[PDB]
Design a protein around this ligand. Structure first.
Ligand SMILES: CC(C)CCC[C@@H](C)[C@H]1CC[C@H]2[C@@H]3CC=C4C[C@@H](O)CC[C@]4(C)[C@H]3CC[C@]12C
Ligand SMILES: CC(C)CCC[C@@H](C)[C@H]1CC[C@H]2[C@@H]3CC=C4C[C@@H](O)CC[C@]4(C)[C@H]3CC[C@]12C
Ligand SMILES: CC(C)CCC[C@@H](C)[C@H]1CC[C@H]2[C@@H]3CC=C4C[C@@H](O)CC[C@]4(C)[C@H]3CC[C@]12C
Ligand SMILES: CCn1c(=O)c2c(nc(/C=C/c3ccc(OC)c(O)c3)n2C)n(CC)c1=O
Ligand SMILES: CCCCCCCC/C=C/CCCCCCCC(=O)O
Ligand SMILES: CCCCCCCC/C=C\CCCCCCCC(=O)O
Ligand SMILES: CCCCCCCC/C=C\CCCCCCCC(=O)O
Ligand SMILES: CCCCCCCC/C=C\CCCCCCCC(=O)O
Ligand SMILES: CCCCCCCC/C=C\CCCCCCCC(=O)O
Ligand SMILES: CCCCCCCC/C=C\CCCCCCCC(=O)O
Ligand SMILES: CCCCCCCC/C=C\CCCCCCCC(=O)O
Ligand SMILES: CCCCCCCC/C=C\CCCCCCCC(=O)O
Ligand SMILES: CCCCCCCC/C=C\CCCCCCCC(=O)O
Ligand SMILES: CCCCCCCC/C=C\CCCCCCCC(=O)O
Ligand SMILES: CCCCCCCC/C=C\CCCCCCCC(=O)O
Ligand SMILES: CCCCCCCC/C=C\CCCCCCCC(=O)O
Ligand SMILES: CCCCCCCC/C=C\CCCCCCCC(=O)O
Ligand SMILES: CCCCCCCC/C=C\CCCCCCCC(=O)O
Ligand SMILES: CCCCCCCC/C=C\CCCCCCCC(=O)O
Ligand SMILES: CCCCCCCC/C=C\CCCCCCCC(=O)O
Ligand SMILES: CCCCCCCC/C=C\CCCCCCCC(=O)O
Ligand SMILES: CCCCCCCC/C=C\CCCCCCCC(=O)O
Ligand SMILES: CCCCCCCC/C=C\CCCCCCCC(=O)O
Ligand SMILES: CCCCCCCC/C=C\CCCCCCCC(=O)O
Ligand SMILES: CCCCCCCC/C=C\CCCCCCCC(=O)O
Ligand SMILES: CCCCCCCC/C=C\CCCCCCCC(=O)O
Ligand SMILES: CCCCCCCC/C=C\CCCCCCCC(=O)O
Ligand SMILES: CCCCCCCC/C=C\CCCCCCCC(=O)O
Ligand code: NA
Length: 384
């Protein structure tokens, strides 16, 4: 069948993806610009990620359509249009890794997050990562390319001029670059690092939630011990365990000041050997526990759960990047590692290419479905 027929389907799908990638990610950027509640370091990387996806629609997809025709081109110009998408993919990887690390910092040392992770430092990291993404993605332009061994028969068949080649991705970009350097080193390794960071995030959240419940039970258990104690040493022993837990859980303020003071009150009575007076003093702790401590427990738990939800949302974005890009990389591995295997058919090549491009569509939906502040800002932008 005439190649223009299957090409027309491929090109139409690519153009549809480009429109959606631009519209959704412009909406992401407009939301962050407009809503100061969305202006935080995490979302600056989200914006850098949306900018990469906008450029997939504006430049990488037009470049992909162009290179699918095999048109005659100077080889190094062909190389640029082949490799620019690698810059955008690499920038996306750096942004995704930064988001994971940012969420790990927020959960693991929340007391120093705002002093460690600042807007000015985020902007510098983003700038550095874009420079590194150009260097990584355009490495073939530095000489790791097949321009030295042009396919002259294909060039002559298409009437190409001197110094020109039929511009085809796999004719100019070396497959050892794509597999060993781009895929294994620059894509697979960062994704595996992201997985490790997310495991650390979720393990830290789970452990901290367990610590909240352990301290809550320790408070209530030791109150019961005092209640059914028959001597002052037992009351003193249990209160000493309560005091260290109360101060450790303090690490509002009034509630914990009352709690520790009332523990000290009962402890002084215990040490004077006045058991009944110490047991009555310790029962007062229940009023403080009900009015203050459980409210702190529930808010801390609610904050940790919100952090889990945000980390899950970020992990979905990273996982969808892997799901959308792995098929094309895996196909490249078959092309490279199995020269006895027939090349993946053209329709599958174009399916894998369009799938990688659909990743630039999906993030705005994840934010809309998973982040109320985005979803609410999206609605206000669309309605207004
Ligand atoms: C700021 C944005 C809009 C700039 C976009 C510039 C793009 C469209 C330009 C910059 C470099 C250009 C390439 C440079 C060299 C060649 C080799 C020639 O034999 C065919 C055209 C080709 C392949 C050009 C295509 C268009 C190109 C990719
Ligand atoms: C990332 C997740 C979704 C897994 C994706 C698996 C895909 C990329 C795998 C599964 C089966 C694979 C195919 C199995 C067999 C062949 C025949 C060979 O002559 C060319 C490669 C080709 C055509 C493979 C291409 C890649 C392939 C389609
Ligand atoms: C966690 C996972 C997704 C990491 C990536 C796995 C990749 C590197 C694996 C999954 C399946 C593998 C392929 C399975 C089969 C073959 C055919 C063989 O003749 C050459 C190697 C080759 C082509 C493998 C290359 C590496 C490969 C593509
Ligand atoms: C991730 C980086 N990357 C690639 O790796 C990639 C790729 N296109 C191809 C292969 C195209 C192709 C192969 C064989 C053909 O004829 C038999 C043919 O007509 C086209 N590949 C391998 N692109 C899209 C521009 C891309 O973005
Ligand atoms: C604000 C955007 C500024 C853009 C600066 C230029 C960006 C792209 C530049 C083109 C890459 C170099 C030319 C491509 C290869 C030339 C072909 C050849 O060498 O024969
Ligand atoms: C926007 C989404 C697709 C636009 C459809 C127009 C493309 C016409 C057919 C493709 C071609 O030029 O061969
Ligand atoms: C996928 C595409 C989502 C597009 C959402 C529709 C709003 C577009 C208007 C805008 O870009 O500001
Ligand atoms: C197409 C590429 C566009 C990407 C950027 C998307 C919009 C992001 C913010 C641009 C700055 C908005 C300032 C416009 C003036 C309106 C205002 O500030 O009230
Ligand atoms: C080039 C593609 C688009 C770049 C858009 C940059 C984002 C503008 C808004 C900045 C912000 O959200 O604070
Ligand atoms: C045309 C070439 C464009 C190259 C990369 C531009 C990237 C701009 C970065 C936008 C995000 C920065 C931010 O979030 O503040
Ligand atoms: C708003 C940004 C606009 C910039 C992108 C516009 C579309 C770019 C599409 C691909 C340019 C490369 C096509 C050049 C074909 C050359 C044909 C020939 O060799 O005679
Ligand atoms: C915001 C603007 C984005 C870009 C708009 C322009 C759309 C470009 C669409 C595809 C360009 C394909 C160029 C054709 C390649 C040359 C064909 C040939 O020489 O055989
Ligand atoms: C959107 C506007 C139209 C895009 C048309 C893309 C046509 C480029 C391929 C032409 C060709 O196959 O020779
Ligand atoms: C390079 C990967 C990102 C560097 C650290 C990101 C942490 C941060 O958000 O400040
Ligand atoms: C081809 C280049 C390869 C080397 C890449 C160099 C990496 C960074 C280059 C210049 C970075 C410019 C931005 C500096 C601001 C950083 C401040 C900060 O970290 O907060
Ligand atoms: C040397 C590689 C070619 C030029 C790379 C520069 C790309 C853009 C750099 C930083 C984007 C702006 C970041 C601001 C936040
Ligand atoms: C920074 C990463 C590499 C920049 C490459 C600049 C493009 C070189 C064009 C090659 C040529 O003129 O033949
Ligand atoms: C293949 C790509 C090779 C990259 C070479 C690495 C060189 C760049 C390394 C990291 C840049 C560190 C940023 C330092 C700039 C100033 C920092 C500061 O002032 O706080
Ligand atoms: C920093 C590195 C800049 C490298 C500039 C690229 C040189 C083009 C390679 C070439 O012309 O063959
Ligand atoms: C995660 C990083 C994975 C690292 C790559 C493993 C490389 C395996 C060696 C390839 C086979 C060598 C050969 O082709 O003979
Ligand atoms: C190849 C592994 C890809 C991992 C993507 C990010 C992992 C997120 C886990 C939850
Ligand atoms: C991390 C995931 C694993 C990384 C390494 C992946 C598999 C490498 C397989 C390549 C070896 C096949 C060589 C083919 C041959 O011997 O002819
Ligand atoms: C990630 C999942 C990767 C899926 C890999 C699935 C099996 C690959 C089987 C390869 C067999 C190639 C047959 C071609 C031939 O022998 O001629
Ligand atoms: C959902 C995805 C829909 C597309 C399904 C992918 C098709 C099967 C995987 C690979 C088998 C097709 C390739 C045939 C192998 C060959 O002829 O070289
Ligand atoms: C996105 C959802 C599905 C998109 C489907 C595939 C788009 C391109 C399909 C290839 C058309 C046939 C080309 C060929 O005959 O080689
Ligand atoms: C579903 C994903 C896309 C399917 C595209 C067409 C696959 C059937 C093979 C086409 C062919 O044999 O030429
Ligand atoms: C076919 C072209 C469009 C493909 C888009 C696929 C992913 C889009 C967003 C999912 C929203 C639910
Ligand atoms: C290809 C992407 C597959 C589905 C994810 C689309 C977004 C889901 C919305 C929740
Ligand atoms: Na992306």
């Amino acid at each position: 069948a005439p190649p223009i027929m299957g090409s027309s389907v491929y090109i139409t799908v690519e153009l549809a993806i480009a429109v959606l990638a631009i519209l959704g990610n412009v909406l992401v950027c407009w939301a962050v610009w407009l809503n100061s509640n969305l202006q935080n370091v995490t979302n600056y990387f989200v914006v850098s990620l949306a900018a990469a996806d906008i450029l997939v629609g504006v430049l990488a997809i037009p470049f992909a359509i162009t290179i699918s025709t095999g048109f005659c081109a100077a080889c190094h110009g062909c190389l640029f249009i082949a490799c620019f998408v690698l810059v955008l993919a690499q920038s996306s990887i750096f942004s995704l890794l930064a988001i994971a690390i940012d969420r790990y910092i927020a959960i693991a040392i929340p007391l120093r997050y705002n002093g460690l992770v600042t807007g000015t430092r985020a902007a510098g990291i983003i700038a550095i990562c874009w420079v590194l993404s150009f260097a990584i993605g355009l490495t073939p332009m530095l000489g790791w390319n097949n321009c030295g061994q042009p396919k002259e028969g294909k060039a002559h068949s298409q009437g190409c001029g001197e110094g020109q080649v039929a511009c085809l991705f796999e004719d100019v970009v070396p497959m050892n670059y794509m597999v060993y350097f781009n895929f294994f080193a620059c894509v697979l390794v960062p994704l595996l690092l992201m997985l490790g960071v997310y495991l650390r995030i979720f393990a830290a959240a789970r452990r901290q939630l367990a610590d909240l419940e352990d301290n809550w039970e320790t408070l209530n258990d030791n109150l019961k011990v005092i209640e059914k104690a028959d001597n002052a040493a037992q009351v003193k022993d249990a209160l000493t365990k309560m005091r260290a837990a109360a101060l450790d859980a303090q690490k509002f303020r009034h509630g914990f000041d009352i709690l520790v003071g009332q523990i000290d009150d009962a402890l002084k009575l215990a040490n004077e050997g006045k058991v009944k007076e110490a047991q009555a003093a310790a029962e007062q702790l229940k009023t403080t526990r009900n009015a203050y401590i459980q409210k702190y427990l529930e808010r801390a738990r609610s904050t940790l759960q919100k952090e889990v939800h945000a980390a899950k949302s970020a992990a979905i974005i990273a996982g969808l990047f892997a799901l959308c890009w792995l098929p094309l990389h895996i196909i490249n591995c078959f092309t490279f590692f199995c020269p006895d295997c027939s090349h993946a058919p053209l329709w599958l090549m174009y399916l894998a290419i369009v799938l990688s491009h659909t990743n630039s569509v999906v993030n705005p939906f994840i934010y809309a479905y998973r982040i109320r502040e985005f979803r609410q800002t999206f609605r206000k932008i669309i309605r207004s």
